[PDB]
Amino acid sequence: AVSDVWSLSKTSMTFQPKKASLQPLTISLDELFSSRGEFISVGGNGRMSHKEAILLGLRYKKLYNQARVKYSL
Amino acid sequence: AVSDVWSLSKTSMTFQPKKASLQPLTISLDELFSSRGEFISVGGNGRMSHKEAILLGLRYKKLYNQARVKYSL
Amino acid sequence: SVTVKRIIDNTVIVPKLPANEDPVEYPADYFRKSKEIPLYINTTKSLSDLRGYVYQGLKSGNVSIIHVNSYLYGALKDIRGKLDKDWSSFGINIGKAGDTIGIFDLVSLKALDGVLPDGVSDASRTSADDKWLPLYLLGLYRVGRTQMPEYRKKLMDGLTNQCKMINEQFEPLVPEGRDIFDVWGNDSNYTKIVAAVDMFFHMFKKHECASFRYGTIVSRFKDCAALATFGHLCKITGMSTEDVTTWILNREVADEMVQMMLPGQEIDKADSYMPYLIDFGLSSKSPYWSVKNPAFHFWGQLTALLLRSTRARNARQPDDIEYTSLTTAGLLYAYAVGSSADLAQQFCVGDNKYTPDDSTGGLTTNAPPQGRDVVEWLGWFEDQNRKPTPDMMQYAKRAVMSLQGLREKTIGKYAKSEFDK
């Protein structure tokens, strides 16, 4: 898919929980973004890394800082 | 993409922050323009530099002077 | 100067307005032509004989002015306080450590009238002085400045503090009850008495005669409401004196703050003459009056109002100031304070939150600045064609729309008329 980083939409990252008895957060690029207009307005392009686009990807439900202290992010 | 400046709509710029602890502002051309109706209305011409098209392109998000003193823009 | 000409026939016009001098008078200037505070109290013509003069003069109206001064003098001049630390103000030192000092240490002079035409005296008077009777006279300066329905609210407790000693006694009447106290504020010696008393017990608070400050405390900073406005604005915003001043966006307010903060006035000094600069006759024109700081009064008070002030509602709306510009500046400052709360963890048990790197991202920057930095907000305002946004308008509308029972020519009446329509 276009752009270069959009081809990573199907594959997901798994984030380790910071708390002992808690289920790891498994997130992908397709879950965090709509189609194309949402991606090409926030700062997401194609030159970015997979992590850089995931860390920017926390915007759709507004959940960066909440997942920052709950997980090993 | 038309015109001559719409070719650089995928690559992004990085601006160095002025404050000691701050994330650098990453900006691309298509992040500040819809298609062509927004680009022609503001003042976007075919003949433009990549910096001048970004700087003068800061209107869609309404942040030219705010990014001028927070970053080395 | 600027030259103005008429276009139609190329003639010169010189726009002229009537001179308006009338400059403010600082407390430090008094001590460059004088080294003492003159208190013209007539020599105490029989101590116990004065207690009958005013006892009836206050009972049935029309009391002697000079007789009140001497009665308070011949009773309070025996109160002595042990000077713990050294004392100095504006040049003249009134003592040092270990020394004993009295209330009337300001320099006492003797009047030349003696006794004003026989005021109705009274025979039946026991030891009521020093107990409750002199305390009642000092507290009549407080009631002599309030004409609103609050004079029967402060004189309420005035006939409760005098009952603490021996008896419950009431002197002034109902109709012409207030028509005899407003005279006292014009007598400069009386204002010098109540101020010196209040200043004395401000040093010696642990003394049992401190209770006298019930009717003398309203003097402290009487003519300094501009400094009160500054203090109030700092408390309501939660920001420091320096940070608040960097939010001044109008030239006239800037002028007034520079005027207010002139160095060497003992503004922040502990135990000084400054708070009582009119009562001690150190000034006839207070640099700390609201009336001399109308722009700062309006701007400071409107901002406070928009930040949910209980006091600013009924504050006077000044005349002859640029309302429209001060409103925009006030709206922007309040909107900035209101949008960005303090909000940070203060205590923790095991874990705590931080975010000193994570500011935005992100490009979701279609939003106002993060903190309360005036520079970021001026840049953001510049992005809005220097025009208040629907959001700010709404914010201010919410702030005023509930207000009720607003009086003519107040900041409350102004704000509502402006934002709620």
Coordinates of C-alpha atoms in Angstrom, one line a residue:
Chain A
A1 CA 0.0 0.0 0.0
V2 CA 0.9 3.7 -0.4
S3 CA 2.7 5.3 1.1
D4 CA 5.8 3.2 2.2
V5 CA 4.7 2.9 5.8
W6 CA 1.0 2.0 4.9
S7 CA 2.1 -1.5 4.0
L8 CA 2.5 -2.2 7.7
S9 CA -1.2 -1.7 8.4
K10 CA -2.0 -5.4 8.7
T11 CA 0.9 -6.4 11.0
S12 CA 0.7 -5.6 14.7
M13 CA 3.0 -4.6 17.6
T14 CA 2.7 -6.2 21.0
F15 CA 3.4 -4.0 24.1
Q16 CA 4.4 -5.6 27.4
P17 CA 2.3 -4.5 30.4
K18 CA 4.0 -2.6 33.2
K19 CA 1.7 -4.2 35.8
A20 CA 2.2 -7.9 36.7
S21 CA -1.3 -9.4 36.2
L22 CA -2.4 -7.5 33.0
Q23 CA -2.9 -8.6 29.4
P24 CA -0.4 -7.1 26.8
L25 CA -1.6 -4.5 24.4
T26 CA -1.5 -5.6 20.8
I27 CA -2.0 -2.7 18.4
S28 CA -1.7 -2.3 14.6
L29 CA -1.7 0.7 12.2
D30 CA -5.1 -0.3 10.6
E31 CA -6.9 0.0 14.0
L32 CA -5.5 3.5 14.7
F33 CA -6.3 5.0 11.3
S34 CA -9.3 5.5 9.1
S35 CA -8.3 5.3 5.4
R36 CA -6.1 8.0 3.8
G37 CA -7.4 11.5 4.7
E38 CA -6.9 10.8 8.5
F39 CA -3.4 9.5 7.9
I40 CA -2.3 12.3 5.6
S41 CA -3.3 15.1 8.0
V42 CA -1.8 14.1 11.4
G43 CA 1.8 13.8 10.3
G44 CA 1.9 10.2 9.1
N45 CA 3.7 9.9 5.7
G46 CA 5.9 7.0 4.7
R47 CA 9.4 7.9 5.7
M48 CA 8.6 7.0 9.3
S49 CA 9.5 3.8 11.3
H50 CA 6.9 1.3 12.4
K51 CA 7.3 2.5 16.1
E52 CA 7.2 6.2 15.1
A53 CA 3.9 5.7 13.3
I54 CA 2.5 3.6 16.2
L55 CA 3.5 6.2 18.8
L56 CA 1.9 8.9 16.6
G57 CA -1.0 6.4 16.0
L58 CA -2.3 7.1 19.5
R59 CA -4.8 9.8 18.5
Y60 CA -7.9 8.0 17.1
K61 CA -9.3 7.2 20.6
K62 CA -6.9 9.7 22.3
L63 CA -4.8 7.2 24.3
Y64 CA -1.1 8.0 24.4
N65 CA -0.4 9.0 28.0
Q66 CA -2.8 6.4 29.3
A67 CA -1.0 3.6 27.5
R68 CA 2.4 5.2 28.4
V69 CA 2.3 4.5 32.1
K70 CA 0.3 1.3 31.9
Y71 CA 2.6 -0.4 29.4
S72 CA 6.4 -0.7 28.7
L73 CA 5.9 1.9 26.0
Chain B
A1 CA 1.1 15.6 -9.0
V2 CA 0.4 19.1 -10.4
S3 CA 1.7 21.6 -10.2
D4 CA 5.5 22.0 -10.0
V5 CA 5.6 22.2 -6.1
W6 CA 3.1 19.4 -5.5
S7 CA 5.9 16.9 -6.3
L8 CA 7.4 17.4 -2.8
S9 CA 4.1 16.6 -1.0
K10 CA 5.4 13.3 0.6
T11 CA 8.8 14.2 2.1
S12 CA 8.8 16.0 5.5
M13 CA 10.8 18.7 7.2
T14 CA 12.2 18.6 10.7
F15 CA 12.4 21.9 12.7
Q16 CA 14.7 22.2 15.8
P17 CA 12.8 23.2 19.0
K18 CA 13.9 26.4 20.8
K19 CA 12.9 25.2 24.3
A20 CA 15.4 22.9 26.2
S21 CA 12.9 20.0 26.5
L22 CA 10.6 19.7 23.5
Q23 CA 9.7 17.4 20.6
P24 CA 10.9 18.7 17.1
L25 CA 8.1 19.7 14.8
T26 CA 7.8 17.4 11.8
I27 CA 5.8 18.8 8.9
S28 CA 5.0 17.7 5.3
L29 CA 3.3 19.7 2.5
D30 CA 0.1 17.6 2.1
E31 CA -0.6 17.8 5.8
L32 CA -1.5 21.5 5.4
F33 CA -3.5 21.2 2.1
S34 CA -6.7 19.3 1.2
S35 CA -6.4 18.9 -2.6
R36 CA -6.4 21.9 -4.9
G37 CA -9.4 24.0 -3.8
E38 CA -7.7 24.8 -0.5
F39 CA -4.3 25.2 -2.2
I40 CA -5.4 27.8 -4.8
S41 CA -7.5 29.8 -2.4
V42 CA -4.7 30.5 0.1
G43 CA -1.9 31.6 -2.3
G44 CA -0.2 28.4 -3.4
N45 CA 1.5 28.8 -6.8
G46 CA 3.3 26.2 -9.0
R47 CA 6.7 28.0 -8.6
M48 CA 7.6 27.6 -4.9
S49 CA 10.5 26.6 -2.7
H50 CA 10.0 23.6 -0.3
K51 CA 10.5 25.9 2.7
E52 CA 8.4 28.8 1.4
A53 CA 5.6 26.4 0.5
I54 CA 5.7 25.1 4.1
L55 CA 6.1 28.5 5.9
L56 CA 3.4 30.3 3.8
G57 CA 1.4 27.0 3.9
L58 CA 0.9 27.3 7.6
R59 CA -2.7 28.5 7.5
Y60 CA -4.8 25.3 7.4
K61 CA -3.7 24.6 11.0
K62 CA -3.6 28.3 11.9
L63 CA -0.1 28.2 13.4
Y64 CA 2.6 30.3 11.9
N65 CA 3.7 32.7 14.7
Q66 CA 3.1 30.0 17.4
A67 CA 5.6 27.7 15.6
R68 CA 8.0 30.6 15.0
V69 CA 8.8 31.2 18.7
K70 CA 8.5 27.5 19.9
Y71 CA 10.8 26.2 17.1
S72 CA 13.6 27.5 14.9
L73 CA 11.2 27.8 12.0
Chain C
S1 CA 5.7 67.5 17.8
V2 CA 3.3 66.3 15.1
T3 CA 2.1 68.7 12.4
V4 CA -1.6 68.6 11.3
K5 CA -2.8 70.4 8.2
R6 CA -6.3 70.8 6.6
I7 CA -6.5 69.2 3.2
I8 CA -9.1 71.4 1.4
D9 CA -7.0 74.6 1.7
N10 CA -3.5 73.6 3.1
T11 CA -3.9 75.5 6.4
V12 CA -2.3 74.3 9.7
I13 CA -4.4 73.2 12.7
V14 CA -3.0 72.6 16.1
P15 CA -5.3 70.2 18.2
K16 CA -5.4 71.4 21.8
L17 CA -6.9 70.1 25.0
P18 CA -7.1 71.7 28.5
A19 CA -4.1 70.9 30.7
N20 CA -4.5 68.1 33.2
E21 CA -1.6 68.0 35.6
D22 CA -2.6 66.7 39.1
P23 CA 0.3 64.3 39.8
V24 CA 0.5 61.6 42.5
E25 CA 2.5 62.1 45.8
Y26 CA 4.8 59.3 47.1
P27 CA 5.4 58.6 50.8
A28 CA 9.2 59.0 50.5
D29 CA 8.9 62.6 49.3
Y30 CA 7.4 63.7 52.6
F31 CA 10.7 62.9 54.4
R32 CA 12.9 65.2 52.2
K33 CA 11.4 68.4 53.7
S34 CA 10.2 67.0 57.1
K35 CA 11.6 64.6 59.7
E36 CA 8.6 64.3 62.0
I37 CA 4.8 63.6 62.0
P38 CA 3.1 66.6 63.7
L39 CA 0.2 65.6 66.0
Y40 CA -1.5 68.8 67.2
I41 CA -3.2 67.6 70.4
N42 CA -4.3 70.3 72.9
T43 CA -2.7 70.0 76.3
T44 CA -4.7 67.6 78.4
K45 CA -6.9 70.0 80.4
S46 CA -7.9 67.8 83.3
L47 CA -8.0 64.0 82.5
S48 CA -11.2 62.8 84.2
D49 CA -13.0 66.1 83.2
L50 CA -12.9 65.1 79.5
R51 CA -14.7 61.8 80.1
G52 CA -17.9 63.8 80.8
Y53 CA -17.6 66.1 77.7
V54 CA -17.8 63.4 75.0
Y55 CA -20.1 61.0 77.0
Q56 CA -23.0 63.4 76.4
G57 CA -21.8 64.8 73.1
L58 CA -22.1 61.4 71.5
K59 CA -25.3 60.6 73.5
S60 CA -27.4 63.4 72.0
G61 CA -25.4 64.4 68.9
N62 CA -23.1 67.3 68.0
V63 CA -19.9 66.5 69.9
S64 CA -16.7 68.6 70.1
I65 CA -14.0 67.5 67.6
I66 CA -10.9 68.6 69.6
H67 CA -12.2 67.1 72.8
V68 CA -12.3 63.6 71.3
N69 CA -8.6 63.9 70.4
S70 CA -7.5 64.8 74.0
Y71 CA -9.6 62.1 75.6
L72 CA -8.1 59.3 73.4
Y73 CA -4.7 60.9 74.1
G74 CA -4.9 61.1 77.9
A75 CA -5.9 57.4 78.1
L76 CA -3.7 55.7 75.5
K77 CA -0.4 57.4 76.2
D78 CA 0.2 55.1 79.2
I79 CA 0.2 51.9 77.1
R80 CA 3.9 50.9 76.8
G81 CA 5.4 48.2 74.6
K82 CA 8.9 46.5 74.8
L83 CA 10.7 47.0 71.5
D84 CA 12.1 43.6 70.7
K85 CA 13.9 44.5 67.5
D86 CA 15.2 47.8 66.1
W87 CA 12.7 50.1 64.3
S88 CA 13.2 52.5 61.4
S89 CA 11.0 54.0 58.6
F90 CA 11.8 56.3 55.7
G91 CA 14.8 57.7 57.5
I92 CA 13.7 58.3 61.1
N93 CA 14.4 55.6 63.6
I94 CA 11.8 55.4 66.4
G95 CA 13.8 53.1 68.7
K96 CA 16.1 50.1 69.3
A97 CA 16.2 46.7 70.9
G98 CA 15.3 46.5 74.6
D99 CA 13.7 50.0 74.8
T100 CA 10.2 50.7 76.0
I101 CA 7.9 52.7 73.7
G102 CA 4.4 54.2 73.8
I103 CA 1.6 54.6 71.2
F104 CA 2.1 58.3 70.7
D105 CA 5.7 58.1 69.5
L106 CA 5.4 60.1 66.3
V107 CA 6.0 63.6 67.8
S108 CA 3.2 65.4 69.7
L109 CA 2.4 69.1 69.5
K110 CA 0.0 71.3 71.4
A111 CA -3.1 73.0 70.0
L112 CA -4.0 76.7 70.8
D113 CA -7.8 76.6 71.3
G114 CA -7.8 75.0 74.7
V115 CA -11.5 74.3 75.2
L116 CA -14.2 74.7 72.5
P117 CA -17.4 76.4 73.7
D118 CA -18.8 74.4 76.6
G119 CA -19.9 71.0 75.4
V120 CA -22.5 69.5 77.6
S121 CA -20.7 67.7 80.4
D122 CA -21.8 64.9 82.7
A123 CA -21.0 64.2 86.4
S124 CA -21.9 60.5 86.7
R125 CA -18.8 58.8 85.2
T126 CA -16.7 56.1 86.8
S127 CA -13.7 54.2 85.5
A128 CA -15.0 53.4 82.0
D129 CA -12.0 54.7 80.2
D130 CA -9.2 52.3 79.0
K131 CA -11.8 49.6 79.3
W132 CA -14.4 50.1 76.6
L133 CA -15.1 53.8 76.1
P134 CA -11.9 54.8 74.1
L135 CA -12.2 51.7 72.0
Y136 CA -15.7 52.8 70.8
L137 CA -14.4 56.2 69.6
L138 CA -11.7 54.7 67.3
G139 CA -14.2 52.3 65.7
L140 CA -16.3 55.3 64.5
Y141 CA -13.9 56.0 61.7
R142 CA -14.9 52.6 60.2
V143 CA -18.6 53.6 60.2
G144 CA -17.8 57.1 59.0
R145 CA -16.9 55.8 55.5
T146 CA -19.8 53.4 54.8
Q147 CA -23.1 54.9 53.7
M148 CA -24.6 51.7 52.2
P149 CA -26.8 49.2 54.1
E150 CA -23.6 47.9 55.8
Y151 CA -23.4 50.6 58.5
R152 CA -26.0 48.5 60.5
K153 CA -23.7 45.5 60.0
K154 CA -20.3 46.9 61.3
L155 CA -21.8 48.9 64.1
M156 CA -23.5 45.6 65.1
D157 CA -20.3 44.1 66.6
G158 CA -19.2 47.6 67.8
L159 CA -21.8 47.3 70.6
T160 CA -20.5 43.8 71.5
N161 CA -16.7 44.5 72.0
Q162 CA -17.5 47.2 74.4
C163 CA -19.7 44.8 76.4
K164 CA -16.7 42.5 76.9
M165 CA -15.4 44.8 79.7
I166 CA -18.2 45.9 82.0
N167 CA -21.5 47.1 80.6
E168 CA -23.7 47.3 77.4
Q169 CA -24.2 50.9 76.4
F170 CA -25.3 52.5 73.1
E171 CA -24.7 56.2 72.2
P172 CA -25.7 57.3 68.7
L173 CA -29.3 57.6 67.4
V174 CA -31.2 56.3 64.3
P175 CA -31.8 59.3 61.9
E176 CA -28.7 61.4 62.5
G177 CA -26.5 58.5 63.6
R178 CA -24.1 58.7 60.6
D179 CA -24.2 62.5 60.2
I180 CA -21.6 63.0 63.0
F181 CA -18.8 60.5 62.1
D182 CA -18.0 61.7 58.6
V183 CA -16.8 65.0 60.1
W184 CA -14.1 63.1 62.0
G185 CA -12.3 61.8 58.8
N186 CA -11.7 65.5 57.9
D187 CA -9.8 66.2 61.1
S188 CA -6.2 65.3 60.3
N189 CA -5.3 64.8 63.9
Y190 CA -8.0 62.1 64.4
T191 CA -6.8 60.2 61.3
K192 CA -3.3 60.4 62.8
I193 CA -4.6 59.0 66.1
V194 CA -6.3 55.9 64.7
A195 CA -3.4 55.2 62.3
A196 CA -0.7 55.5 65.1
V197 CA -2.8 53.1 67.3
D198 CA -3.2 50.5 64.5
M199 CA 0.5 50.8 63.6
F200 CA 1.6 50.3 67.2
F201 CA -0.4 47.1 67.8
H202 CA 0.8 45.8 64.4
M203 CA 4.2 45.7 66.0
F204 CA 3.1 44.4 69.4
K205 CA 0.4 41.9 68.6
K206 CA 0.9 39.7 71.7
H207 CA 0.0 42.6 73.9
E208 CA -3.5 42.4 75.4
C209 CA -4.5 45.9 74.2
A210 CA -4.2 44.7 70.6
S211 CA -8.0 44.2 70.7
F212 CA -8.2 48.0 70.1
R213 CA -7.5 47.1 66.4
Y214 CA -11.2 46.3 66.0
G215 CA -12.0 49.8 64.7
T216 CA -8.5 50.8 63.7
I217 CA -7.7 48.0 61.2
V218 CA -9.7 49.4 58.4
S219 CA -7.1 52.2 58.2
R220 CA -4.3 49.8 57.2
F221 CA -4.0 50.3 53.4
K222 CA -7.2 52.4 53.2
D223 CA -5.9 54.3 50.1
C224 CA -4.2 51.4 48.4
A225 CA -7.0 49.6 46.5
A226 CA -4.8 49.4 43.4
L227 CA -2.3 47.3 45.3
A228 CA -5.3 45.2 46.6
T229 CA -6.4 44.6 43.0
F230 CA -2.9 43.5 42.1
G231 CA -2.8 41.1 45.1
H232 CA -6.3 39.8 44.3
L233 CA -5.3 39.2 40.6
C234 CA -2.3 37.2 41.7
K235 CA -4.3 35.0 44.1
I236 CA -7.1 34.3 41.6
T237 CA -4.7 33.3 38.7
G238 CA -2.3 31.5 41.0
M239 CA 0.6 33.1 39.3
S240 CA 3.4 35.3 40.7
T241 CA 3.7 39.1 40.7
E242 CA 6.3 38.9 38.0
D243 CA 4.4 36.6 35.7
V244 CA 1.1 38.6 36.1
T245 CA 2.9 41.8 35.1
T246 CA 4.3 40.1 31.9
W247 CA 0.6 39.6 31.0
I248 CA 0.0 43.4 30.8
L249 CA -0.9 44.0 27.1
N250 CA -2.0 47.6 27.2
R251 CA 0.2 50.7 27.3
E252 CA -1.9 52.6 29.8
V253 CA -1.9 49.7 32.2
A254 CA 1.9 49.5 31.8
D255 CA 2.3 53.2 32.6
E256 CA 0.2 52.7 35.8
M257 CA 2.1 49.6 37.0
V258 CA 5.4 51.4 36.6
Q259 CA 3.9 54.3 38.6
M260 CA 2.6 51.8 41.2
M261 CA 5.9 50.0 41.6
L262 CA 8.3 53.0 41.9
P263 CA 11.2 51.9 44.1
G264 CA 11.8 53.0 47.7
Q265 CA 8.3 53.3 49.0
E266 CA 8.6 50.4 51.6
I267 CA 5.7 48.7 49.8
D268 CA 6.6 45.2 51.2
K269 CA 8.3 46.4 54.4
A270 CA 7.0 45.1 57.7
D271 CA 5.9 47.8 60.1
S272 CA 6.0 51.0 58.1
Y273 CA 4.2 54.4 57.7
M274 CA 3.4 53.6 54.1
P275 CA 0.0 51.8 54.7
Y276 CA -1.3 54.9 56.4
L277 CA 0.0 57.5 53.8
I278 CA -3.1 59.7 53.8
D279 CA -4.0 59.3 57.5
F280 CA -0.5 60.4 58.6
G281 CA -0.7 63.3 56.0
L282 CA 2.3 61.9 54.1
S283 CA 0.4 62.3 50.9
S284 CA -2.7 64.1 49.6
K285 CA -2.7 62.1 46.4
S286 CA -2.3 58.4 46.7
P287 CA -0.2 56.7 43.9
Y288 CA -2.1 53.5 44.9
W289 CA -5.6 54.8 44.4
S290 CA -7.9 53.0 42.0
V291 CA -9.0 56.4 40.6
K292 CA -5.3 57.1 39.6
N293 CA -5.0 53.6 38.1
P294 CA -8.3 53.3 36.1
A295 CA -7.0 51.1 33.3
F296 CA -5.3 48.7 35.6
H297 CA -8.4 48.8 37.8
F298 CA -10.7 47.9 34.9
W299 CA -8.4 45.4 33.2
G300 CA -7.4 43.7 36.5
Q301 CA -10.9 43.5 37.9
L302 CA -12.5 42.4 34.6
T303 CA -10.0 39.5 34.3
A304 CA -10.7 38.6 37.9
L305 CA -14.4 38.7 37.3
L306 CA -14.1 36.4 34.2
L307 CA -12.1 34.0 36.5
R308 CA -15.1 33.7 38.9
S309 CA -14.3 36.6 41.3
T310 CA -16.8 37.2 44.1
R311 CA -15.4 40.8 44.6
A312 CA -15.1 42.2 41.1
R313 CA -18.8 42.0 40.4
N314 CA -19.6 45.3 42.1
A315 CA -16.4 47.1 41.5
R316 CA -16.7 50.6 39.9
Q317 CA -16.5 51.0 36.2
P318 CA -14.0 53.9 35.6
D319 CA -14.6 56.7 33.1
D320 CA -12.3 57.9 30.3
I321 CA -10.5 54.7 29.5
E322 CA -10.2 52.6 26.3
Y323 CA -12.8 49.9 27.2
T324 CA -12.6 47.9 23.9
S325 CA -8.9 47.2 24.1
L326 CA -8.8 46.4 27.8
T327 CA -11.6 44.0 27.3
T328 CA -9.8 42.1 24.5
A329 CA -6.6 41.9 26.7
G330 CA -8.7 40.8 29.7
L331 CA -10.6 38.2 27.7
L332 CA -7.4 36.7 26.3
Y333 CA -5.7 36.5 29.7
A334 CA -8.7 35.0 31.4
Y335 CA -9.2 32.6 28.5
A336 CA -5.5 31.6 28.8
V337 CA -5.8 31.1 32.6
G338 CA -9.2 29.3 32.3
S339 CA -8.1 26.9 29.5
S340 CA -4.9 25.8 31.2
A341 CA -5.3 24.5 34.7
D342 CA -2.4 23.8 37.2
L343 CA -3.1 20.0 37.3
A344 CA 0.0 18.0 38.4
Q345 CA 0.4 15.2 40.9
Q346 CA 1.5 16.4 44.3
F347 CA 1.8 13.2 46.4
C348 CA 2.4 9.5 45.6
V349 CA 2.3 6.1 47.3
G350 CA 4.1 3.9 44.9
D351 CA 3.9 5.3 41.3
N352 CA 3.6 8.8 40.0
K353 CA 2.8 10.4 36.6
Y354 CA 5.2 12.6 34.5
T355 CA 5.1 14.1 31.0
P356 CA 8.0 16.6 30.7
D357 CA 8.9 15.5 27.1
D358 CA 5.4 14.6 25.8
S359 CA 3.8 18.0 24.9
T360 CA 1.7 17.4 21.7
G361 CA 2.9 15.3 18.8
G362 CA 1.2 15.4 16.5
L363 CA -0.2 18.2 14.4
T364 CA -3.5 18.1 16.5
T365 CA -2.3 21.7 17.2
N366 CA -5.6 23.2 16.0
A367 CA -5.8 24.1 19.7
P368 CA -4.6 27.0 22.0
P369 CA -1.1 27.0 23.7
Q370 CA -0.3 24.6 26.5
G371 CA 0.8 26.7 29.5
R372 CA 0.4 30.3 30.5
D373 CA 3.3 31.8 28.5
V374 CA 2.3 35.2 27.2
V375 CA 4.6 34.8 24.1
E376 CA 2.9 31.6 22.9
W377 CA -0.6 33.2 23.4
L378 CA 0.3 36.4 21.5
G379 CA 1.5 34.2 18.7
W380 CA -1.7 32.1 18.8
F381 CA -3.8 35.2 18.9
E382 CA -2.0 36.6 15.9
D383 CA -3.1 33.4 14.0
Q384 CA -6.7 34.3 14.7
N385 CA -6.5 37.7 12.9
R386 CA -6.2 39.3 16.4
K387 CA -9.9 38.5 16.8
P388 CA -11.5 36.7 19.8
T389 CA -12.7 33.2 18.7
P390 CA -16.2 31.8 19.1
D391 CA -14.7 29.7 21.9
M392 CA -13.4 32.7 23.9
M393 CA -16.7 34.5 23.3
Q394 CA -18.6 31.5 24.7
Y395 CA -16.2 31.1 27.6
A396 CA -16.8 34.7 28.6
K397 CA -20.6 34.3 28.1
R398 CA -20.6 31.4 30.5
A399 CA -18.6 33.4 33.0
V400 CA -21.2 36.3 33.2
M401 CA -24.6 34.9 32.2
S402 CA -25.5 33.7 35.7
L403 CA -24.8 37.1 37.4
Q404 CA -27.9 38.8 39.0
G405 CA -28.7 42.0 40.8
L406 CA -26.0 44.0 39.0
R407 CA -25.6 47.7 39.8
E408 CA -25.2 50.6 37.4
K409 CA -21.7 51.5 36.4
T410 CA -20.0 48.4 37.7
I411 CA -17.6 46.0 36.1
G412 CA -20.2 43.3 36.6
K413 CA -22.9 45.4 34.8
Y414 CA -20.3 46.0 32.0
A415 CA -19.2 42.4 31.5
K416 CA -22.7 41.0 31.3
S417 CA -23.8 43.7 28.8
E418 CA -20.7 42.8 26.7
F419 CA -20.6 39.0 26.6
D420 CA -24.2 37.9 27.3
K421 CA -26.5 38.9 24.3

